[PDB]
Amino acid sequence: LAALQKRRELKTAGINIKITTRKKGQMDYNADIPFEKKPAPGFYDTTE
Amino acid sequence: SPPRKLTAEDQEAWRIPPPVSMWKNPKGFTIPLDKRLAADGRQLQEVQ
């Protein structure tokens, strides 16, 4: 909560920076759908 | 093969009693003393 407050104050007063808590040995679940398993196609079209 | 047709008496006959240990209490529960002494057969034990 404190870090969020400080980042919001910086973004309000101009400077925007990427506080990145990404450690050593951790995936980026935001970056990509992890271990993505798409639904199997069936007889019905699902493009729409 | 088609599922076995069970009765409510079959369900009751395979329900399992909640185990109260006389030694272990991992969650630190407070168990009522009748429930603590239920599974003891030393109340059953008869001496002639």
Binding site: - | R4, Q11, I16, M22, W23, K24, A39, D40, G41, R42
Partner: protein, 53 residues
């Protein structure tokens, strides 16, 4: 001893899954492994183990 316990628990569980009739609700089976532990402690203390019901 840790390995014997792992093997024993797997054997008792496989027997119980194969003993249970199809269609009984089967979440609480680890409950039976707790009964197995308590029965073993009862044997070590020479206390008769008799769960009502």
């Amino acid at each position: 001893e840790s390995h014997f316990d792992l093997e024993l628990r797997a054997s008792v569980m496989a027997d119980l899954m194969d003993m249970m009739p199809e269609g009984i609700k089967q979440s609480k089976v680890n409950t039976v492994l707790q009964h197995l532990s308590e029965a073993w402690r009862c044997w070590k203390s020479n206390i008769p183990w008799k769960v009502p019901g």
